[PDB]
Amino acid sequence: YSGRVIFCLDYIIFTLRLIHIFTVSRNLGPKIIMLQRMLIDVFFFLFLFAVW
Amino acid sequence: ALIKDRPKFVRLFLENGLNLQKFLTNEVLTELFSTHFSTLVYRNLQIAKNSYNDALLTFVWKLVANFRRSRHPLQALFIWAILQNKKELSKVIWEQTKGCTLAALGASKLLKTLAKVKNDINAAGESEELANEYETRAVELFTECYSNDEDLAEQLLVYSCEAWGGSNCLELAVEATDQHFIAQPGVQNFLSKQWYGEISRDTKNWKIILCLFIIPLVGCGLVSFRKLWYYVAFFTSPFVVFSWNVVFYIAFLLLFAYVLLMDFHSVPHTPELILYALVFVLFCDEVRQWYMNGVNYFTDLWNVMDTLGLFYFIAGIVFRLHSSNKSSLYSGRVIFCLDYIIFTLRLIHIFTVSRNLGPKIIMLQRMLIDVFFFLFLFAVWMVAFGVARQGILRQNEQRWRWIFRSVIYEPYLAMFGQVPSDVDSTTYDFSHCTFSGNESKPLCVELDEHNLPRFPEWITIPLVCIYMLSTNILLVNLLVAMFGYTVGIVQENNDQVWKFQRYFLVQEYCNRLNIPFPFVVFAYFYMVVKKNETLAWEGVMKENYLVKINTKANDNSEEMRHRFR
Amino acid sequence: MVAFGVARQGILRQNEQRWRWIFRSVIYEPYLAMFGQVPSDVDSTTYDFSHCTFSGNESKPLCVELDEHNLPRFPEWITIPLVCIYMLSTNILLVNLLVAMFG
Numbered sequence A: 001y002s003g004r005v006i007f008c009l010d011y012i013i014f015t016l017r018l019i020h021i022f023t024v025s026r027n028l029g030p031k032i033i034m035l036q037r038m039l040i041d042v043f044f045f046l047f048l049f050a051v052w
Numbered sequence B: 001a002l003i004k005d006r007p008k009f010v011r012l013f014l015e016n017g018l019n020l021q022k023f024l025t026n027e028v029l030t031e032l033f034s035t036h037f038s039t040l041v042y043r044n045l046q047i048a049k050n051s052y053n054d055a056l057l058t059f060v061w062k063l064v065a066n067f068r069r070s071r072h073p074l075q076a077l078f079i080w081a082i083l084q085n086k087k088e089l090s091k092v093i094w095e096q097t098k099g100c101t102l103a104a105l106g107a108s109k110l111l112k113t114l115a116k117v118k119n120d121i122n123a124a125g126e127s128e129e130l131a132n133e134y135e136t137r138a139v140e141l142f143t144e145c146y147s148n149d150e151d152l153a154e155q156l157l158v159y160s161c162e163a164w165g166g167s168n169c170l171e172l173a174v175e176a177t178d179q180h181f182i183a184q185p186g187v188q189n190f191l192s193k194q195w196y197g198e199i200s201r202d203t204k205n206w207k208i209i210l211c212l213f214i215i216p217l218v219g220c221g222l223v224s225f226r227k228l229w230y231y232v233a234f235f236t237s238p239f240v241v242f243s244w245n246v247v248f249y250i251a252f253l254l255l256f257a258y259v260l261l262m263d264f265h266s267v268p269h270t271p272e273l274i275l276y277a278l279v280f281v282l283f284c285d286e287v288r289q290w291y292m293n294g295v296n297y298f299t300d301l302w303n304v305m306d307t308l309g310l311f312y313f314i315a316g317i318v319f320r321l322h323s324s325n326k327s328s329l330y331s332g333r334v335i336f337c338l339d340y341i342i343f344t345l346r347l348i349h350i351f352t353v354s355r356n357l358g359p360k361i362i363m364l365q366r367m368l369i370d371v372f373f374f375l376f377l378f379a380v381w382m383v384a385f386g387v388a389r390q391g392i393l394r395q396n397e398q399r400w401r402w403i404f405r406s407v408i409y410e411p412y413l414a415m416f417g418q419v420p421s422d423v424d425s426t427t428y429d430f431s432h433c434t435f436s437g438n439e440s441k442p443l444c445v446e447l448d449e450h451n452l453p454r455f456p457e458w459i460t461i462p463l464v465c466i467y468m469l470s471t472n473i474l475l476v477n478l479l480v481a482m483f484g485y486t487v488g489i490v491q492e493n494n495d496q497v498w499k500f501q502r503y504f505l506v507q508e509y510c511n512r513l514n515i516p517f518p519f520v521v522f523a524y525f526y527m528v529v530k531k532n533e534t535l536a537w538e539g540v541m542k543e544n545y546l547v548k549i550n551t552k553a554n555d556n557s558e559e560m561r562h563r564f565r
Numbered sequence C: 001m002v003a004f005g006v007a008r009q010g011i012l013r014q015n016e017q018r019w020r021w022i023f024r025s026v027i028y029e030p031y032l033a034m035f036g037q038v039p040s041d042v043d044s045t046t047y048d049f050s051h052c053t054f055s056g057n058e059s060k061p062l063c064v065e066l067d068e069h070n071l072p073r074f075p076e077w078i079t080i081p082l083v084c085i086y087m088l089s090t091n092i093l094l095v096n097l098l099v100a101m102f103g
Ligand SMILES: CC(C)CCC[C@@H](C)[C@H]1CC[C@H]2[C@@H]3CC=C4C[C@@H](OC(=O)CCC(=O)O)CC[C@]4(C)[C@H]3CC[C@]12C
Pocket: A024, A025, A026, A027
């Protein structure tokens, strides 16, 4: 069971790399690039939410 | 001078007593076309004509080939000049010709034809520059021409082409989506007058609709009818026919629904027969439209959807007649319901000419990329979380239906509202387990160790929290932000785009037989049984246009320098 | 709303012969789906019955389907996708477009 759990977590890590490898399509990649610039807003929202 | 590309000398020769008609009438033309042509230009023209072809491409290519092997003199020099991207030699030829707006539009389309090729970047960009240039000239010429005489301008716009390219001025404009030319007031007003018909364009836009329901009310002159006799003119107006068809379509939809769900039996009753008759008439009109067009009729989607609706309906008709089998009746009812779904959504499409909300409907097409991007991200996250949770909880399932139900459906259900799963928390569980697969319930949780759940709680709950946080609120808010930007940016272009579509629909509706829908059958049955001055005025307006250009050029007010000298 | 409601009601409960209930099922529940809850739990067949009324005497919805020798007859592989697509389009896409237009 412990090994199966480790496998599932490894699968989670493996899957998300698809979004990264799909940055050259030229049909939706420029949108993927802009996600990096939106982290500060998320962090600010999380700070306020956690305090409340 | 023509051979050596001396534009100023050409102009000086022409204006200073030279007669171009006599010079062109000589056989020199043949010579000028047999040898002068650049080899690469000839090869590129031939390959372009072969690859794409068109109503005009073949005409000019054939004339040129005829001259090379061994009337319309100036139309040949114009194309000669325009092929080689000669800016200063094409304009003079354009000025000399007759009916020059038409030639300018054709040349604009022709230049835009070859812009796409990537063999040479500069060779394409320069030609595209000239293509853009000619459109403004044509538009300004027509705008100046129309501001003086409405009737003569409208007459000019419908001149029957004498095989310049086998198409009219308006036809050439619509060929290549030069929306600016059509969107300009003049053509729009022409289309409005064409659509309304006899009725005046100041009828208050609601009195006619009121009079439509009350046939006897036509007598009293509530409407400014002037541009019995009325009852054959009022009912021939395309506007009234369209409104009456819309009303009939809504009534048919109501009857179809009532027959479908309220009253359905093994043996059809009279309402079913009436509905069959109406769908038959729709099918006949569909075949008419199929005939008048070729195979390009299938290029768009709505016609395909209509065809699919008719085919589904006839398939349902076939299915339902087997009264012996009770199951076939249910299958036919299902087919009818799906066909009804297809039928209903066409209302939104047919409501694109209201002018009160249609421009909004047009913009929906530009928002598909955002939806697809959102769906891509959502699907990836859904797959990840579902696979992980199902793998860690319920060991082996050996049933495709339930595994697909758990992996995808519930995490998808988590998008709006409810938590993806209550199984993650262990405080409540059991009473729904099924150790054996006989029962139709999910496989029991975990591989419980001496009768206790085995999975931990300190990984499942954070998984759920993070997954829901990312999918439910972040992605949706990003979607709304993208929608906001997209709707904001494309606003100004929207009106022109919608006006172009307005023309495309106005001509289609005017061309139709213009008979109220129920009685059209008789028309087809009877059909089966049966089976110069304007150019001079344009030249004058051109003289004025060129004088205006010269005055604009001279408006620099720099003559003080030469006066000082 | 009209499209989805008519299709679902037509495919599930055969003939109703009661204007009030047909209007209640065709319009009201799909409308209720706009904010929050799923338009209908009837689509899934794992849970059903205990609310059926074969006769129209009682004030409950007409029983599901024309069950064949005591089993529900309607399939699950068209109803569920219908619900998913309808809810996707109505609940979130239209509302987000509304907020963008308001902005
Ligand atoms: C179940 C399995 C066996 C089949 C699943 C199908 C996918 C593997 C196929 C379907 C469509 C394919 C895609 C069609 C288009 C593109 C864009 C292409 O990106 C570019 O090169 C664009 C370059 C540019 O625009 O200049 C890369 C391949 C990709 C993702 C293709 C790769 C593989 C895809 C995703």
